[model samples]
Target: MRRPTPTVYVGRVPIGGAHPIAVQSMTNTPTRDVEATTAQVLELHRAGSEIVRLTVNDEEAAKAVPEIKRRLLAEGAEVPLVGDFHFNGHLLLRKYPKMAEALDKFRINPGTLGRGRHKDEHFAEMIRIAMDLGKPVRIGANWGSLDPALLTELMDRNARRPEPKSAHEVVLEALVESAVRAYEAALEMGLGEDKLVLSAKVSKARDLVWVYRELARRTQAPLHLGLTEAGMGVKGIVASAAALAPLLLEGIGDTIRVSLTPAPGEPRTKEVEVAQEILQALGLRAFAPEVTSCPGCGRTTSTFFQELAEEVSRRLKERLPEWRARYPGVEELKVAVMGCVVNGPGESKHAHIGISLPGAGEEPKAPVYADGKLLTILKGEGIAEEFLRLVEDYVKTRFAP
Candidate 1:
């Protein structure tokens, strides 16, 4: 049921179409700080983010683009760097050719540019730069920061109606219109069809899905899907994922970025990891081997099985980079680590390799299954180490690069 969206290439990375759902992350560092922004871009690149974006808010930030690109190239990370622009984007992108040329892509919030005639002028200029450079652009509009003039106009028109519409309903309609209009404007400004991407990002799941689905029905342009500034911590992750999951399931998104605010001391790269995890969970993409573990209950005691599951999961995550390098497509490998016998055997039999560790007061042996067949029984002190080895060996043997 998935339709191949128009392919918009950001540097060498091809998004939309039948391409893998691309993952992107934005840098929060001061854009004027060349060293800090460059380092963050490279960090995101190494963490498996396909594309990295930086804010180009002011003159200083605009001037810093080439330096950021230069440093990224010097460090040998050619990952596509996108310039995120706002109110002055039109002036800045046009004023700084070096800034325009350094970026592989440009992201503009159609609503963020000034209103009325100024808005059209600025939006057109940014599109012009991208067209001239043969680069792609994301016309990202957000519900929280939607163009007030347009929303007001829409609400005013609706208010004259015999039956007045709800404010919530009015906002959703405005979001879709804003995105579709921006997309039309880009094309009207003579940008190539394939050079334009669109997004109508919102903070709420209901509004997000509704806007995207409406946008999809209207435009053939690729969609950059996400909940804008999707808060921080558990609420952020869950809400963003909830908004995105249905869109993806219905074959809607082309590229996705999870806009999670990192908790204190948490790396910004968590956003990139979360995007990849979402796609992988949806069976749309895979980046590392999967570990399916069970939640512990009363049937599970002594914590041995639970602790071993934790260790296996920790090892798999920590060793992901090593495995990705040494094995081809090994990321799709499934390893199950169950806590008890309740659902252990059935679940273990499902994974490519799995361990059905003993439950409380039941048996001492942990049975390891390979490809659904019991291959080994381990007891005593070395069971954990041996079970992991069996998993490692199973992957090496079954998933040949």
Candidate 2:
């Protein structure tokens, strides 16, 4: 599929115009906790985050920016770093030019400057400084903090008897309008077209799609997609993927982040993994080797495939770094673990490697296939483990540089 032409470049990465869509995630660790933040950034990068953003809310967080970049550089992680700023961002950017220098991009919320004339002036100044430093800027608009003036205008325009405007309509309009306004302002302030990225995030999937569609129709600025505050675990992953898939299919987004609320004790990079899954499913991006498993039925000879799938996923995550460094072109490698032979081999014919387990009437052996041809049969006891080792060997032989 041909991609849209990208208008801007972020660090060494390009967005738009046939360029592959970039996947990104934000570090949830407090930016001042330099060690924690740096570790999270590295994990996200390994999980396929092309751009990693860190919140810079106060002086201390801003101060840690340079150190974070320095540490990543020393450790050989070169993913582009973005600074997420709110409220007093203009002040911090002005006060610490060095901090601005540390970031590859600056993400600003226009509403952070309050309302009316003061907000415009503050936003303009932020864009000018970003332009001076030659760093790209992301005009991030969220429903929870829509620009006041735009909201007021939308309310007035939609005001009527009875129900008036629905909350969804008002929020969507505010997000789209605010983002377009910011993009226009940046252009007016002498920033080039390729130096801006825009986002319209809302907690609800429908609202997110609506706002992004409007924003895309109105402007050519590259869009950054996310479903904000998507609750943690399976629910969050499904919700974000449902929201992002259609837009991605239509070529509306340039980059994406899955904002999963971190589960207790779970690392923030879980969100990064979820984002990678969604992108991989849509064929927009690829991470480690893919694993396809079947849902077991009574015809199955072994236990259910749930545990098997989970184990395979965990193993892939554990060995992803080595696999990535070893296998360059096989970014989307497919490995299937099927519960029974009913439709297993045929279903997995397209996979790079496939395994179909024996059923009740059949022998207790499974068949392995590579590129649709039957390769061999093995016992089911340690099939997953053996298949993983075979995949590693395949990578070594075919893709090792």
Candidate 3:
């Protein structure tokens, strides 16, 4: 069961309170370039990000927000757009009323709101703008930009203690404090609970888990979960999964971002894909048909079996957009592409559709299963096209509703 909390809407996309955990990604494009930013937002949304965030740093970027939104709407893409604000967010939102109105949500990092009384004024000013615009706000507290004043106060108090907590522990506590206090302040300033979300992001997977757990315990606001700067490639994916899996399993997290630092030439959509995969792997949501394949062994002809699995995966990915539109609940479809007869038949039999290929000594035919019964056998070449044909037909017939 998901944690009970107020529902916050980023446009029509809801977070918390029985809603499916939302997948979100940030655009790296220069926000002032309306064309590039608009295209990237649409690209991420099409790739399955429920919400797309883009930075709103300067006047040019702020002025461009409405135009980008207009372009997205012209394309019939209604995916929610979040304006990520930093030092000048209060000024930007106040200066450009159209940008504030155009954005579905505002993400403000409490740590970046300056120091002393200026911090309070900056944060309250942004919250006031959000309330006036009737837009949801995310009080995103990243460890990388944690408020130095708060950290120092906690450290000073800890130093006077009989048993001072470790520096890491103090920092974690400070992060939670940052989010909770900001949340409380937002509420006090008349922003409804339903218009608030909180996140305490840290780079270390374990630290992220720790901070979020504490935040969850302290606040009823929906949590936006992510492991910030979760570096390039496999490292990013693994760390995000490790941190997110535990909290999600425990009924925490309402919206999530994978925060992957894309490798050179990697598409921005990869983060969206990774976020959806994480949610799918957790059984929280499904975005596409899942293909289960076995690692080849001595009993299997590795080359042919591997090719078959790759073809199936490729075809499904290429066709998913069309399939999803025509076939309702098609994302739940599971297809197994197994290597050999040993565990292949059993595993294949377990899926909605499965194919068990020939082993070295067995008959050179491949048996397919649909709905747990033997469907057909394939011989020689053209197996890939034949199996995919079966899958396509299966989807059309089985998921017609």
Q: What TM-score goes with each of the models?
A: 0.97, 0.91, 0.97
Across 286-341, the per-residue lDDT of candidate 1 in tens digits comes to 88888899887887766786788788888888877788888788888899988778
Residue-wise lDDT of candidate 3 within 270-304, one digit each (tens)? 98889999999989998899999999888887588
Candidate 2 regions off by >4 Å? Answer: 1-5, 160-167, 304-319, 379-401
- Residue-pair clashes per candidate: 0, 6, 0
Candidate 2 overall lDDT versus native? 0.82
Better of 1 and 2 by lDDT: 1
Q: Which residue segments of model 3 deviate by more than 4 Å?
A: none
Question: For model 2, how does the per-residue alpha-carbon lDDT over 137-216 read when each residue is reduced to its tens digit?
Answer: 99998888878778878888778536677866886887888889888988888898889888889988877778888988
Which portions of model 1 miss their true places by more than 4 Å?
160-162
How displaced is residue 383 in candidate 2, in Å?
4.4
Q: By the lDDT metric, which is better: model 1 or model 3?
A: 3
Clashing pairs in 2: 4-17, 5-16, 5-17, 6-16, 6-17, 8-194
Q: Give the TM-score (vs. native) of candidate 3.
A: 0.97
